[PDB]
């Protein structure tokens, strides 16, 4: 999974 | 999956 | 932010 | 921030 | 799995 | 920040 903020 | 803020 | 795949 | 995959 | 700020 | 895979 990827979290980008 | 995925979280873009 | 931005995520591309 | 970003992510290119 | 990928985190980017 | 930056990601490019």
Given at each position: ?5
């Amino acid at each position: 999974g990827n979290l980008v903020s």
